């Protein structure tokens, strides 16, 4: 019971240190920058073939292929350039919540209420795509697993825990503990040396994959966090929570930098992504609309309308030439 | 060019995938999906004898396929994975009517499900289970329901009741009070987009499949009529 006083004192010390480090405001420092303007992105492709809501999608490193998952229990590999179904993998369980595309393009992964991140080999010698390894050990539902290389995959689960796996032996190598609520998303750093996570406790944490211990914690939200993305230079990240607000956090400063919100928006954010230059922030909302934010001025640059039901997933290509958005109406759209 | 072979192969693969997807869509649409809910120790696992996202079940009545699911391997918190069932035909709710201690928890869970944003257009089939145990408790008359629900002391059996022959007035009154407790929340809001179908079940019952069949038929018919603005 005495430890509560020490915890409160440490929290007060951290808050005071941050307040001291708060020299100025990003809005002030970027006051004189000319506004980005008005963005008028228009739909270029529409991908049909899913029977139910689409929950997740992911781009390949070649900026042409992508994968998606839906409640009907199917993974479809698309060719965005020339709309074509390269693969259609039927899953054992129809409740799938995430998909991943390996950087090498040889494997994809998915998982859901089955508490498993299954891995499929897209380069079988026989020619028929089949499941390669099934990873068991998580207790709650599997909300995200993202590839590190052809042999390592990071995972987050609804039991308030992440993990690092060894696909060859299918054994957990590291367990990341400390979150109080269900971990909903994670983002790898470009240097593949750290990653951040967001959970249903209005907090996000910075992890060290090689070490296995939390380095920093960020708390500036009011409700659960559903999405998280990493800045291109790996020195900041953005989050989206149920309080209808996205915030930008900096690792070195250890604080939130700016808040993107509008009084007319009272819907939670389901996805966030960054443009290649890191100037535009794209967020998906429950009102069937996706907004584009000036990441340096918190001004609504533009809107991405044209989805019927709730928009659930977002993505920007590695070359940063297009944006893909999936939604509960079972359609994916590519935006120039 | 000499690269038309790539396009030919891609088109052929897409055609085969679409051909399979057509049959997949037919099968997917021909079947109805149900979500099974309820607290522990409630008969949830034995409501339907099954003699025909973690626990699955399949049964057929009159050659109509059904698919039931039970999310029984998660944490206590359910405000996130519950959203993944916003397009099911119906929600089947099983409540132990003889557990006065947990009746309030069951009522609160039902209210949350009914008032949830993403579940605002789902009808609920309410199975009030363990009627023999409730009758035994009432007949023994050692624990009074008024201890937990003070308003029970001024509740009278509805005129429209259909007591089963031989059932005591006391047991009928308690049973119908329990049912009305849920019905009050069910009718307190909804705008007519969904309704509740209360039922009185027993552990040794076997008619539950037919009851679910009839309730689903009624739900779909009402949906169509509302679509045409009839209702």
């Amino acid at each position: 019971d005495q430890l509560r006083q020490e915890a409160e004192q440490l929290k007060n010390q951290i808050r005071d240190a941050r307040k001291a480090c708060a020299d100025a405001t990003l809005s002030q420092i970027t006051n004189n920058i000319d506004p980005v303007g008005r963005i008028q992105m228009r739909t270029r492709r529409t991908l049909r073939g899913h029977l139910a809501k689409i929950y997740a999608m992911h781009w390949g490193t070649d900026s042409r292929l992508l994968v998606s998952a839906s409640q009907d229990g199917k993974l479809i590999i698309w060719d965005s350039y020339t709309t074509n179904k390269v693969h259609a993998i039927p899953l054992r369980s129809s409740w799938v919540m995430t998909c991943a595309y390996a950087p090498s393009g040889n494997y994809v992964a998915c998982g859901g209420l089955d508490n498993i991140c299954s891995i499929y080999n897209l380069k079988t010698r026989e020619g028929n795509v089949r499941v390669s390894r099934e990873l068991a050990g998580h207790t709650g539902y599997l909300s995200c697993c993202r590839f590190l290389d052809d042999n390592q995959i990071v995972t987050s689960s609804g039991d308030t825990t992440c993990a690092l796996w060894d696909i060859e032996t299918g054994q957990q190598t590291t367990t990341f503990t400390g979150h109080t609520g269900d971990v909903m998303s994670l983002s790898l750093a470009p240097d593949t040396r750290l990653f951040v996570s967001g959970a249903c406790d209005a907090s996000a944490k910075l992890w060290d994959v090689r070490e296995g211990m939390c380095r920093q914690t960020f708390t500036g939200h009011e409700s659960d966090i559903n999405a998280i993305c990493f800045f291109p230079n790996g020195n900041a990240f953005a989050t989206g929570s149920d309080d209808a607000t996205c915030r930008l956090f900096d690792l070195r400063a250890d604080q939130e930098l700016m808040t993107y919100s509008h009084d007319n928006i009272i819907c939670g954010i389901t996805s966030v992504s960054f443009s290649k230059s890191g100037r535009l922030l794209l967020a998906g909302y429950d009102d069937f609309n996706c907004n584009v934010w000036d990441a340096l001025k918190a001004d609504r640059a533009g809107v991405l309308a044209g989805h019927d039901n709730r928009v659930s997933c977002l993505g920007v290509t590695d070359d940063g030439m297009a944006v893909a958005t999936g939604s509960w109406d079972s359609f994916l759209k590519i935006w120039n | 060019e000499d690269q038309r072979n790539e396009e030919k192969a891609q088109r052929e693969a897409n055609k085969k995938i679409e051909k399979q997807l057509q049959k997949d869509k037919q099968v997917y649409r021909a079947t109805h999906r149900l979500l099974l809910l309820g607290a522990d120790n409630s008969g949830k696992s034995t409501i339907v004898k099954q003699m025909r996202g973690i626990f699955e079940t399949k049964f057929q009545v009159d050659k109509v396929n059904f698919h039931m699911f039970d999310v029984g391997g998660q944490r206590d918190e359910r405000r996130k994975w519950i959203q993944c069932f916003n397009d099911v035909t119906a929600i089947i709710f099983v409540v132990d009517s003889s557990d006065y201690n947990r009746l309030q928890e069951a009522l609160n869970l039902f209210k949350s499900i009914w008032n949830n944003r993403w579940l605002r257009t789902i009808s609920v089939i309410l199975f009030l289970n363990k009627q023999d145990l409730l009758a035994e408790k009432v007949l023994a008359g050692k624990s009074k329901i008024e201890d937990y629900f003070p308003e029970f002391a001024r509740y009278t059996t509805p005129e429209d009741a259909t007591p089963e022959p031989g059932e005591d007035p006391r047991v009928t009154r308690a049973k119908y009070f329990i049912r009305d407790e849920f019905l009050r929340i069910s009718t307190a809001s909804g705008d007519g987009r969904h309704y509740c179908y209360p039922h009185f079940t027993c552990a040794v019952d076997t008619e539950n499949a037919r009851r679910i069949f009839n309730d689903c038929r009624d739900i779909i018919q009402r949906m169509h009529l509302r679509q045409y603005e009839l209702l």
Partner: nanobody
Framework: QVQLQESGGGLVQPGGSLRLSCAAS????????MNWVRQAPGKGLEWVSD????????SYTGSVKGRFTISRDNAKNTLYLQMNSLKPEDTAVYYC?????????????????????RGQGTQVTVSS
């Protein structure tokens, strides 16, 4: 950032009176539904009462109806619970819980020592 600290509580004789307070910070108080929950020894969490954003709609469990009253003040970010005629069966730790999301009427906040928007709890004991 989100914090709920509960004042009040202590020792009292049967049939007495008591008042609890829960000062909140780290979120917009006016946009959320607040509840009171308690845990008697050897038992799980049980929902006691809740109040709406504006204070229009209120609800009480059967065991405490007519004896407890729940009040809300939005200009000070304080949640109250007036306990009267409290019986010996009211001995428990009384937590002050907030519903997960704003502008809604639904909550799942009796999770086993898991809910993150719930306070530390204050002891209330009734005895001779």
């Amino acid at each position: 950032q989100v914090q709920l600290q509960e004042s009040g509580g202590g020792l009292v004789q049967p049939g007495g009176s008591l008042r609890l307070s829960c000062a909140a910070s780290g979120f917009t108080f006016s946009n959320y539904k607040m509840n009171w929950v308690r845990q008697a020894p050897g038992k799980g969490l049980e929902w006691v009462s809740d109040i709406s954003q504006s204070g229009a709609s209120i609800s009480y469990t059967g065991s405490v109806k007519g004896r407890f009253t729940i009040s809300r003040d939005n200009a000070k970010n304080t949640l109250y619970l007036q306990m009267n005629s409290l019986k010996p069966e009211d001995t428990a730790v009384y937590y002050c819980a907030r519903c997960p999301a704003p502008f809604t009427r639904d909550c799942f906040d009796v999770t086993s020592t898991t809910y993150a928007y719930r306070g530390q709890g204050t002891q209330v004991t009734v005895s001779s």
